[PDB]
Design a protein around this motif. Structure first.
Motif, PDB file in Angstrom:
ATOM      1  N   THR B  27       0.840  -1.227   0.000  1.00  0.00           N
ATOM      2  CA  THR B  27       0.000   0.000   0.000  1.00  0.00           C
ATOM      3  C   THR B  27       0.862   1.259   0.000  1.00  0.00           C
ATOM      4  O   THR B  27       0.423   2.330  -0.421  1.00  0.00           O
ATOM      5  CB  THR B  27      -0.950   0.034   1.207  1.00  0.00           C
ATOM      6  N   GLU B  28       2.113   1.125   0.475  1.00  0.00           N
ATOM      7  CA  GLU B  28       3.118   2.149   0.210  1.00  0.00           C
ATOM      8  C   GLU B  28       3.489   2.124  -1.282  1.00  0.00           C
ATOM      9  O   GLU B  28       3.931   3.112  -1.856  1.00  0.00           O
ATOM     10  CB  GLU B  28       4.355   1.960   1.082  1.00  0.00           C
ATOM     11  N   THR B  29       3.294   0.952  -1.879  1.00  0.00           N
ATOM     12  CA  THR B  29       3.477   0.772  -3.316  1.00  0.00           C
ATOM     13  C   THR B  29       2.460   1.585  -4.109  1.00  0.00           C
ATOM     14  O   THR B  29       2.813   2.263  -5.079  1.00  0.00           O
ATOM     15  CB  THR B  29       3.354  -0.710  -3.714  1.00  0.00           C
ATOM     16  N   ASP B  30       1.200   1.507  -3.686  1.00  0.00           N
ATOM     17  CA  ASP B  30       0.134   2.277  -4.327  1.00  0.00           C
ATOM     18  C   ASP B  30       0.518   3.748  -4.460  1.00  0.00           C
ATOM     19  O   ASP B  30       0.276   4.376  -5.495  1.00  0.00           O
ATOM     20  CB  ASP B  30      -1.170   2.124  -3.539  1.00  0.00           C
ATOM     21  N   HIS B  31       1.122   4.293  -3.410  1.00  0.00           N
ATOM     22  CA  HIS B  31       1.653   5.649  -3.452  1.00  0.00           C
ATOM     23  C   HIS B  31       2.815   5.753  -4.437  1.00  0.00           C
ATOM     24  O   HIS B  31       2.949   6.751  -5.145  1.00  0.00           O
ATOM     25  CB  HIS B  31       2.110   6.097  -2.057  1.00  0.00           C
ATOM     26  N   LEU B  32       3.636   4.711  -4.459  1.00  0.00           N
ATOM     27  CA  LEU B  32       4.755   4.639  -5.394  1.00  0.00           C
ATOM     28  C   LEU B  32       4.270   4.605  -6.835  1.00  0.00           C
ATOM     29  O   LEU B  32       4.874   5.216  -7.722  1.00  0.00           O
ATOM     30  CB  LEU B  32       5.618   3.400  -5.100  1.00  0.00           C
ATOM     31  N   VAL B  33       3.171   3.878  -7.060  1.00  0.00           N
ATOM     32  CA  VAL B  33       2.574   3.790  -8.385  1.00  0.00           C
ATOM     33  C   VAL B  33       1.874   5.096  -8.757  1.00  0.00           C
ATOM     34  O   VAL B  33       2.073   5.622  -9.864  1.00  0.00           O
ATOM     35  CB  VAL B  33       1.570   2.628  -8.479  1.00  0.00           C
ATOM     36  N   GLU B  34       1.065   5.614  -7.833  1.00  0.00           N
ATOM     37  CA  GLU B  34       0.397   6.895  -8.011  1.00  0.00           C
ATOM     38  C   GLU B  34       1.391   7.951  -8.477  1.00  0.00           C
ATOM     39  O   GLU B  34       1.282   8.472  -9.589  1.00  0.00           O
ATOM     40  CB  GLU B  34      -0.271   7.345  -6.709  1.00  0.00           C
ATOM     41  N   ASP B  35       2.365   8.260  -7.626  1.00  0.00           N
ATOM     42  CA  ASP B  35       3.460   9.141  -8.018  1.00  0.00           C
ATOM     43  C   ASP B  35       4.057   8.698  -9.353  1.00  0.00           C
ATOM     44  O   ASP B  35       4.183   9.506 -10.264  1.00  0.00           O
ATOM     45  CB  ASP B  35       4.537   9.176  -6.933  1.00  0.00           C
ATOM     46  N   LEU B  36       4.415   7.424  -9.435  1.00  0.00           N
ATOM     47  CA  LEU B  36       5.118   6.834 -10.563  1.00  0.00           C
ATOM     48  C   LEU B  36       4.541   7.268 -11.906  1.00  0.00           C
ATOM     49  O   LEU B  36       5.276   7.425 -12.886  1.00  0.00           O
ATOM     50  CB  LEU B  36       5.079   5.305 -10.468  1.00  0.00           C
ATOM     51  N   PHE B  76      -4.236  -7.575  -3.264  1.00  0.00           N
ATOM     52  CA  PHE B  76      -2.821  -7.329  -2.998  1.00  0.00           C
ATOM     53  C   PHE B  76      -2.420  -7.886  -1.637  1.00  0.00           C
ATOM     54  O   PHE B  76      -1.624  -8.822  -1.535  1.00  0.00           O
ATOM     55  CB  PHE B  76      -2.498  -5.834  -3.062  1.00  0.00           C
ATOM     56  N   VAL B  77      -2.987  -7.309  -0.580  1.00  0.00           N
ATOM     57  CA  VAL B  77      -2.595  -7.659   0.779  1.00  0.00           C
ATOM     58  C   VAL B  77      -2.774  -9.143   1.066  1.00  0.00           C
ATOM     59  O   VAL B  77      -2.131  -9.685   1.965  1.00  0.00           O
ATOM     60  CB  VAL B  77      -3.394  -6.857   1.826  1.00  0.00           C
ATOM     61  N   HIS B  78      -3.643  -9.802   0.307  1.00  0.00           N
ATOM     62  CA  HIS B  78      -3.887 -11.226   0.510  1.00  0.00           C
ATOM     63  C   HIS B  78      -2.976 -12.078  -0.366  1.00  0.00           C
ATOM     64  O   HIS B  78      -2.791 -13.261  -0.084  1.00  0.00           O
ATOM     65  CB  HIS B  78      -5.353 -11.557   0.232  1.00  0.00           C
ATOM     66  N   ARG B  79      -2.423 -11.458  -1.400  1.00  0.00           N
ATOM     67  CA  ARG B  79      -1.547 -12.111  -2.361  1.00  0.00           C
ATOM     68  C   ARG B  79      -2.364 -12.919  -3.374  1.00  0.00           C
ATOM     69  O   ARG B  79      -1.830 -13.715  -4.143  1.00  0.00           O
ATOM     70  CB  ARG B  79      -0.512 -12.998  -1.657  1.00  0.00           C
ATOM     71  N   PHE B  80      -3.667 -12.695  -3.352  1.00  0.00           N
ATOM     72  CA  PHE B  80      -4.567 -13.127  -4.414  1.00  0.00           C
ATOM     73  C   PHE B  80      -4.194 -12.458  -5.733  1.00  0.00           C
ATOM     74  O   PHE B  80      -4.355 -11.250  -5.895  1.00  0.00           O
ATOM     75  CB  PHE B  80      -6.007 -12.797  -4.030  1.00  0.00           C
ATOM     76  N   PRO B  81      -3.703 -13.248  -6.678  1.00  0.00           N
ATOM     77  CA  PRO B  81      -3.005 -12.706  -7.848  1.00  0.00           C
ATOM     78  C   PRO B  81      -3.946 -12.080  -8.869  1.00  0.00           C
ATOM     79  O   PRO B  81      -3.833 -12.320 -10.070  1.00  0.00           O
ATOM     80  CB  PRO B  81      -2.341 -13.942  -8.453  1.00  0.00           C
ATOM     81  N   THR B  82      -4.890 -11.265  -8.394  1.00  0.00           N
ATOM     82  CA  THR B  82      -5.772 -10.531  -9.295  1.00  0.00           C
ATOM     83  C   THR B  82      -5.654  -9.031  -9.050  1.00  0.00           C
ATOM     84  O   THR B  82      -6.528  -8.418  -8.447  1.00  0.00           O
ATOM     85  CB  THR B  82      -7.237 -10.968  -9.138  1.00  0.00           C
ATOM     86  N   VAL B  83      -4.553  -8.465  -9.525  1.00  0.00           N
ATOM     87  CA  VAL B  83      -4.207  -7.068  -9.312  1.00  0.00           C
ATOM     88  C   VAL B  83      -3.908  -6.377 -10.637  1.00  0.00           C
ATOM     89  O   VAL B  83      -3.246  -6.946 -11.504  1.00  0.00           O
ATOM     90  CB  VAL B  83      -2.982  -6.921  -8.386  1.00  0.00           C
ATOM     91  N   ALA B  84      -4.402  -5.153 -10.800  1.00  0.00           N
ATOM     92  CA  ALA B  84      -4.231  -4.469 -12.079  1.00  0.00           C
ATOM     93  C   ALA B  84      -3.856  -3.002 -11.891  1.00  0.00           C
ATOM     94  O   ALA B  84      -4.115  -2.414 -10.843  1.00  0.00           O
ATOM     95  CB  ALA B  84      -5.486  -4.589 -12.910  1.00  0.00           C
TER      96      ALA B  84
END
Lengths: 244, 244
Positions: B27-36, B76-84
């Motif tokens: 979820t720190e990643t989400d910020h990384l992606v947002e910025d990204l 994501f947090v569950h590692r359920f591989p359905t992320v886009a």
């Protein structure tokens, strides 16, 4: 029971080959796959028993194969890439091994009694999540579309949803749904009116991954009961069989 | 808008590897992606506007970006591989291009108006199902759970299953769900309370793929309406629409 386990692995992915190349196209494959597996296991061990679709699910004490050639029937037809073969094996009225191939993603799920569970080489292990509110729970609709199972369906989801579940998922495959369980990708599973060939293989795996598999009631698993509660923890499992 | 499109594509892919990366942890990643993405495009096209999680879906006629760094957060947090990852683009108050990249199973869906839809370089076409009774439909619980937004989910669902629908599917990724619709593995989609950044990009791909994307009420899409019905055929969209 190696030679048999190896027969299961070798066939599950040869079948898994047949279904991938079949999916590319635009009930025949099923039989094809069924008659492939069962004819070779048959006159490989002519005196063994079987339990696939084609009462009830009466497991003896003899070496028994418990087979689902194609799990994800409907998904196949819409080419929803969630399709699977599941080959479970029992001895002494106990579940010995299981082999579940994700045809699409090429993930061999294996599980031997007491020897752990693996997806593609590396070891699996459930989650241990105990708080239902933090959990991702799996389940499936069903073939039968009677207003009594459909009301049922909607009843249990509300219970699970009013149980305050993190999220629900239905993917058109109980076999893979449970393998998600075993690996940690989910934290609980339930369903009513599902045959045991969809159950056998997944259970050894889910167990071997450290999880739990019980009757919907919270009691012990009953192959002929056509239902399940599979969980990351016996706590989680208890919360679920309680709700509903 | 060639310059721009390959900008999102490269970020959808940049973001993706970061997602796949961060997913790898334990979820720190989400910020990384947002910025990204917002960062780069910002500098690149500073005259443009951004529609993202941070009134909300008020689209003007200016060149605007509609982004979801991560779709499939709970997954994501569950590692359920359905992320886009979702980067959508509009100009002159119309949806121009969309780019959706199944991080884990590494699929970059794209669609550009007039210039059809694709996944990984293969032309997408909707299923062409009008028989609602033969439909694989997808939905999502959604964000909130306050009893309001939770007994609706079951009323909708109950209705859908009531219509003798082939199957229901919830996978925890609005954009991914909607991509399936594009691909042809599903027949329709419906949701109440989904934001435009989940919906901007997908609607482009479904459209260019030959699918219909409309308002929940049967009317045309209202991006400020936080609801959608999408389907293989206007025929289907209605049968769904007139179930709700």
């Amino acid at each position: 029971w190696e030679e048999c386990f190896q027969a299961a692995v070798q066939l599950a992915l040869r079948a898994g080959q047949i279904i991938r190349k079949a999916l590319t196209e635009e009930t025949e494959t099923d039989h094809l796959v069924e008659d492939l597996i069962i004819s070779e296991l048959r006159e490989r061990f002519p005196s063994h028993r079987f339990i696939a679709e084609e009462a009830k699910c009466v497991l003896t004490h003899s070496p028994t194969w418990i087979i689902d050639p194609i799990d994800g029937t409907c998904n196949f037809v819409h080419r929803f890439p969630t399709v699977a073969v599941s080959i479970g094996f029992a001895v002494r009225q106990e579940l010995e091994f299981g082999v579940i191939y994700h045809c699409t993603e090429e993930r061999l799920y294996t599980g031997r009694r007491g020897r752990g569970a693996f997806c593609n080489g590396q070891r699996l292990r459930v989650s241990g999540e105990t708080d239902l509110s933090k959990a991702l729970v799996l389940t499936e609709i069903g073939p039968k579309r009677d207003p009594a199972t459909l009301k049922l369906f909607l009843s249990n989801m509300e219970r699970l949803l009013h149980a305050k579940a993190h999220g629900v998922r239905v993917i058109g495959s109980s076999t893979l749904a449970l393998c998600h369980l075993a690996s940690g990708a989910a934290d609980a599973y339930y369903q009513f009116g599902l045959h045991c060939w969809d159950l056998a293989a997944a259970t050894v795996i889910i167990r071997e991954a450290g999880g739990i598999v019980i009757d919907t009631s919270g009691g012990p698993l009953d192959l002929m009961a056509c239902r399940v509660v599979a969980a990351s923890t016996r706590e989680m499992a208890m919360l679920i069989a309680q709700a509903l």
